[PDB]
Design an enzyme around this catalytic site. Structure first.
Site, PDB file in Angstrom:
ATOM      1  N   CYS A   1     -42.642 -13.946 -38.123  1.00 26.80           N
ATOM      2  CA  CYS A   1     -42.077 -12.974 -39.056  1.00 26.80           C
ATOM      3  C   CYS A   1     -42.604 -13.119 -40.470  1.00 26.80           C
ATOM      4  O   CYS A   1     -42.436 -12.199 -41.277  1.00 26.80           O
ATOM      5  CB  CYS A   1     -40.549 -13.100 -39.122  1.00 26.80           C
ATOM      6  SG  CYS A   1     -39.689 -13.000 -37.561  1.00 26.80           S
TER       7      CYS A   1
ATOM      8  N   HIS B   1     -47.769  -4.104 -50.330  1.00 24.07           N
ATOM      9  CA  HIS B   1     -47.166  -3.271 -51.367  1.00 24.07           C
ATOM     10  C   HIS B   1     -46.673  -1.934 -50.825  1.00 24.07           C
ATOM     11  O   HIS B   1     -45.863  -1.278 -51.490  1.00 24.07           O
ATOM     12  CB  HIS B   1     -48.175  -3.042 -52.503  1.00 24.07           C
ATOM     13  CG  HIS B   1     -47.552  -2.700 -53.824  1.00 24.07           C
ATOM     14  ND1 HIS B   1     -46.235  -2.973 -54.128  1.00 24.07           N
ATOM     15  CD2 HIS B   1     -48.087  -2.144 -54.940  1.00 24.07           C
ATOM     16  CE1 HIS B   1     -45.980  -2.579 -55.365  1.00 24.07           C
ATOM     17  NE2 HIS B   1     -47.089  -2.080 -55.882  1.00 24.07           N
TER      18      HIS B   1
ATOM     19  N   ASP C   1     -41.896  -3.441 -53.235  1.00 23.50           N
ATOM     20  CA  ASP C   1     -42.339  -3.156 -54.598  1.00 23.50           C
ATOM     21  C   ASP C   1     -42.250  -4.412 -55.470  1.00 23.50           C
ATOM     22  O   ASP C   1     -41.788  -5.471 -55.039  1.00 23.50           O
ATOM     23  CB  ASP C   1     -41.583  -1.951 -55.196  1.00 23.50           C
ATOM     24  CG  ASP C   1     -40.121  -2.235 -55.592  1.00 23.50           C
ATOM     25  OD1 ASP C   1     -39.666  -3.386 -55.705  1.00 23.50           O
ATOM     26  OD2 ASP C   1     -39.401  -1.237 -55.807  1.00 23.50           O
TER      27      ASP C   1
END
Lengths: 245, 245, 245
Positions: free
Chosen positions: C164, C220, C224
């Site tokens: 993960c 991105h 953010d």
């Protein structure tokens, strides 16, 4: 999903504009950079190296070179050149170029280093040959003569060929660190920012030490994070130990 | 040769999953980021600005406005906008946009600055116009008004257009530095991280100074490392030196 | 605009060269990295965490374990895995994978963390499962067992599945920070560099504190800048406050 087009904006709606064409050099550089950016997966390592005693040694050798009227001023970047050259000897996979298809690595047995030099037309990168086999005095003389040639804009195409590795020292103009782009077909580049005196722990107290910030960007298809750390550490240790020539 | 496809993994075999669709705004921004990332070769410069005296000035001025009942709070980022606006005046190549074929540069005369503002739906970038022609109080009133409009989610499309440059200040949430992505068709973005008291050498001893870490990412097709260093130094020194307004 | 092709250079004109075929493992690794670099818009956050009390606690617990004949040595990276695991619980958007077309986000309800381990064939990343449900002692045992298995080249396909989030700790080899590449289909990766004793302001003086530099690279399109700061801050605060297990 397909790529969105570049923004089409009427900038005149917001005020005055002036559209100028780039120089051929900038167009050549920009094209090379756009290629290198997408083909080279970049990783950047940062480090700081104690140059307190190197700087004392440099100043010592500079007076002793003036007494002999040798006409040579040793600058810090010459020491970085030799440290990088010695590191390329110890980890030869950094002295290499990867083929286009990514399948074949060309290991170089010669060590030439490009040094970024700022000119009235921007940074150019002359290449210096056999750095591992040359002394500090000799390399200082070449750098003086060729940097002059660069500022006067009469650099030769041949004089910028054959690099194995690039050093980009911008600290005289600013920054505490930066993350440069690899100069393909090289696999690594060293950035150098402005040295600063910092309090450094000696095991029992903080003492003032001149610390030089350095950075290493590299082609992650060739170099993994661990080897990048080994390489920048060798440059660190070498620079913090150098006191000959 | 051809790029390996994105990994295909049955995540459900490791545990519970929930597949959610990205929002409408996240889809558009994600498409822009995918384009900007591959066509803009990024270099990031790092620096630290001594804001000791500036912070003292800001608090004093905030006290002045308070005890005269002016209902305006001067935040640090407005000083950053003015320093960026002065840097864009002095180095107009940073106040520009490159065409999609990388051949022509549009030099903008107007100076509008986008400022990242955090909202319950994430960071949005309102654009403030004529920053070089506006004082600190006026810009602080604008910032107060637009940040509430942002936080309340009332921003119109027009209020987000015309940017020449972006400031993204996340230091209130953390980080000591970061490397932001350029907001095309702009060519550079200033990141601002968390300030901290640091010992700073004055020639004889370390003195505590409030240092603000800043970063500058830029389109290397337009800006080389030397000009990037000059630019972040101008921002650094201009910001540190403000004692008016 | 057409992409300029890879440089065609006759390196043998500068000196002796040796062309070597990459191994299969190295070819696949580069292919995975080349895809990740172009499809993931990378932002990197930097931070430093105060581990002064954590290290004295780990040393104390490693002494108690030996005095209790528990036969288990606790390394710093297991504390980092739990801090990351807790951050993943608190900001579940970091525990996720974006779809190939960038339109859909798979939120994961399980927490598995890959840890980069050095081998004779370079860094490899075995995956540890259910970190959020395992104690520090238990994870150290798996770490020791699986690290040796990695060095022996005996990792199974299953021992690399299910990740993960990746932690890449190269600080035992050097660097003060670095900017890793995200290990797709994960959305973030934590880099860990070399700890150093630093002067830290306490309101009226500088006190020596052991600071661990960490870095966070992230997709991105998903995260953010403000959420990245919140995330690295949680890891920072959790790591600097651990006094159990």
């Amino acid at each position: 999903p397909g790529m969105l087009p570049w923004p089409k904006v009427d900038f005149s709606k917001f005020g005055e504009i002036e559209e100028v064409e780039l120089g051929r050099i900038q167009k050549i550089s920009g094209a090379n950079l756009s290629r290198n950016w997408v083909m080279i997966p970049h990783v950047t390592h940062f480090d700081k190296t104690d140059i307190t005693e190197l700087e004392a040694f440099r100043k010592q050798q500079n007076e002793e070179a003036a007494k002999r009227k040798l006409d040579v001023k040793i600058t810090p970047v010459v020491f970085i050149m030799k440290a990088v050259a010695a590191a390329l000897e110890q980890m030869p996979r950094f002295n290499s170029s990867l083929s286009e298809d990514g399948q074949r690595l060309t290991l170089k047995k010669y060590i030439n280093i490009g040094v970024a030099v700022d000119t009235p037309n921007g940074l150019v990168v002359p290449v210096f040959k056999d750095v591992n086999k040359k002394g500090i005095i000799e390399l200082s003389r070449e750098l003086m003569t060729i940097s002059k040639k660069a500022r006067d804009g009469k650099l030769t195409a041949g004089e910028m060929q054959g690099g194995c590795f690039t050093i980009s020292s911008i600290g005289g103009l600013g920054t505490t660190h930066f993350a440069p782009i690899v100069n393909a077909p090289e696999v690594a580049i060293l950035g150098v920012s402005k040295s600063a005196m910092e309090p450094v722990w000696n095991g029992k107290e903080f003492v003032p030490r001149l610390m030089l910030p350095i950075s290493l960007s590299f082609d992650h298809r060739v170099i993994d994070g661990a080897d990048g750390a080994r390489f920048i550490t060798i440059i660190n240790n070498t620079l913090s130990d150098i006191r000959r020539l």
